[PDB]
Enzyme design. Structure first.
Site, PDB file in Angstrom:
ATOM      1  CG  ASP A  35      -1.662   1.156   1.472  1.00 19.84           C
ATOM      2  OD1 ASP A  35      -1.986   2.080   0.137  1.00 19.84           O
ATOM      3  OD2 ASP A  35      -2.554   1.563   2.347  1.00 19.84           O
ATOM      4  CB  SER A 199      -2.264  14.441 -13.531  1.00 16.87           C
ATOM      5  OG  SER A 199      -2.601  14.181 -14.795  1.00 16.87           O
TER       6      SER A 199
HETATM    7  N1  LIG Z   1      -4.190   3.284   0.405  1.00 17.66           N
HETATM    8  C1  LIG Z   1      -4.179   4.067   1.807  1.00 17.66           C
HETATM    9  C2  LIG Z   1      -5.058   5.239   1.793  1.00 17.66           C
HETATM   10  C3  LIG Z   1      -6.397   5.343   1.914  1.00 17.66           C
HETATM   11  C4  LIG Z   1      -7.217   6.492   1.960  1.00 17.66           C
HETATM   12  C5  LIG Z   1      -6.492   7.664   1.757  1.00 17.66           C
HETATM   13  C6  LIG Z   1      -7.173   9.009   1.756  1.00 17.66           C
HETATM   14  F1  LIG Z   1      -8.632   8.703   1.865  1.00 17.66           F
HETATM   15  F2  LIG Z   1      -6.785   9.591   3.014  1.00 17.66           F
HETATM   16  F3  LIG Z   1      -6.821   9.943   0.704  1.00 17.66           F
HETATM   17  C7  LIG Z   1      -5.006   7.688   1.666  1.00 17.66           C
HETATM   18  C8  LIG Z   1      -4.355   6.495   1.609  1.00 17.66           C
HETATM   19  N1  LIG Z   2      -6.490   1.686   1.286  1.00 17.07           N
HETATM   20  C1  LIG Z   2      -5.945   0.584   2.527  1.00 17.07           C
HETATM   21  C2  LIG Z   2      -6.981  -0.333   2.501  1.00 17.07           C
HETATM   22  C3  LIG Z   2      -6.777  -1.557   1.394  1.00 17.07           C
HETATM   23  C4  LIG Z   2      -7.533  -2.483   1.416  1.00 17.07           C
HETATM   24  C5  LIG Z   2      -8.760  -2.584   2.332  1.00 17.07           C
HETATM   25  C6  LIG Z   2      -9.597  -3.728   2.206  1.00 17.07           C
HETATM   26  F1  LIG Z   2      -9.836  -4.191   0.796  1.00 17.07           F
HETATM   27  F2  LIG Z   2      -9.125  -4.990   2.770  1.00 17.07           F
HETATM   28  F3  LIG Z   2     -10.822  -3.193   2.605  1.00 17.07           F
HETATM   29  C7  LIG Z   2      -8.931  -1.573   3.018  1.00 17.07           C
HETATM   30  C8  LIG Z   2      -8.038  -0.462   3.150  1.00 17.07           C
END
Ligand SMILES: NCc1ccc(C(F)(F)F)cc1
Ligand SMILES: NCc1ccc(C(F)(F)F)cc1
Length: 330
Positions: A35, A199
């Site tokens: 992630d 972008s």
């Molecule tokens: N994949 C992690 C993640 C999930 C949500 C956000 C948000 F909503 F804060 F932009 C940032 C990073």
């Molecule tokens: N952005 C982080 C994140 C990644 C995967 C999930 C899930 F799919 F497991 F719900 C939740 C939050």
């Protein structure tokens, strides 16, 4: 040194990608979601509440001869979707595709939200944003990438996500056989802790390219593409019968329509997202309404270049002292 690991979609919609990771001595292999939008390495464990585990492989620190409890450390995380988890912190040896880090902080989940419990394919997350976002208290911990940086041949990792197909995460080198043309690099802001970039514009299908600055984050941990309301409206206006649905919470479209591609700008280069990548299938089994992979960021507060966009490219995360993001067609 370098590392290389295959990442695999968890389902037929590419809702997430899991990558095998070895933790502990002897190795315990868990399938983690890599992630780039978060900075915590956390795992299901033998400490996780029993009712909150449904088929995940769990990390068991008591069976690892290299695991040390990080006395007094706790962690708590909340994701932008509403997901959350928390627990205590061990240090252990962690290897990804041959690349080994000793003394990596491994956050043992004692509690997890329901959305994690229901996803039996995901054993945890490996965060790859900047270490300023890590939630370990009272001593902040470094990510796997930050801990490996000194030993890597080159302080980079690359994401090559597949469309309905396996892909590759590489650490420490750039596979020049994995893309076509040149890599276009663009500046990153680390001020919010994300791989944040700008972008240079967009186009819908075969339409004119609209030059406009879209600030957003490169996030392997988010499934869809979340862009400003104006851009998203211009895309779905080109799909007959498309409409924004409040009960569904997004744009839906008739499953019999064909979708135009979506182009986004990287400096002077253009990354083309084929229309098939934007189809996320019926909103419910048997329905003739399909869910769109491009959605508005208005409710979120930040634009997100999720898997929909990133799987259309070879992406370099350059963690040099001045960080940059590289994009290439593939
Ligand atoms: N994949 C992690 C993640 C999930 C949500 C956000 C948000 F909503 F804060 F932009 C940032 C990073
Ligand atoms: N952005 C982080 C994140 C990644 C995967 C999930 C899930 F799919 F497991 F719900 C939740 C939050």
């Amino acid at each position: 040194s370098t590392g290389s690991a295959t990442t695999t979609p968890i389902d037929s919609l590419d809702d997430a990608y899991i990558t095998p990771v070895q933790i502990g001595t002897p190795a315990q292999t868990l399938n983690l979601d890599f992630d780039t939008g978060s900075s915590d390495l956390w795992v299901f464990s033998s400490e996780t509440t029993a009712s909150e585990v449904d088929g995940q492989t769990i990390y068991t620190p008591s069976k690892s001869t290299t695991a040390k409890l990080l006395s007094g450390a706790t962690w708590s995380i909340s994701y932008g979707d509403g997901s959350s988890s928390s627990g205590d912190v061990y240090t252990d040896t962690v290897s990804v595709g041959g690349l080994t880090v000793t003394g990596q902080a491994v956050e043992s989940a004692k509690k997890v939200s329901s959305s994690f419990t229901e996803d039996s394919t995901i054993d945890g997350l490996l965060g790859l944003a900047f270490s300023t976002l890590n939630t370990v208290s009272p001593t902040q911990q470094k990510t796997f990438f930050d801990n490996a940086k000194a030993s890597l041949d080159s302080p980079v990792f690359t994401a090559d996500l597949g469309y309905h197909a396996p892909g590759t995460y590489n650490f420490g080198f750039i596979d020049t056989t994995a893309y076509t043309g040149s890599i276009t690099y663009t500046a990153v802001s680390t001020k919010q802790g994300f791989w944040e970039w700008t972008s240079t514009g967009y186009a819908v299908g075969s339409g004119t390219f609209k030059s406009t600055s879209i600030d957003g984050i490169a996030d392997t941990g988010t499934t869809l593409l979340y862009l400003p309301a104006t851009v998203v409206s211009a895309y779905w206006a080109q799909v007959s019968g498309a409409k924004s649905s409040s009960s569904v919470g997004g744009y839906v479209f008739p499953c019999s329509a064909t979708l135009p591609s979506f182009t986004f700008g990287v400096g002077s280069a253009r990354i083309v997202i084929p229309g098939d990548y934007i189809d996320f299938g019926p909103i419910s089994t048997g329905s003739s309404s399909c869910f769109g992979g491009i959605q508005s960021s208005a409710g979120i507060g930040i634009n997100i270049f999720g898997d929909v966009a990133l799987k259309a490219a070879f992406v370099v995360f350059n963690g040099a002292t001045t960080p940059t993001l590289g994009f290439a067609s593939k």
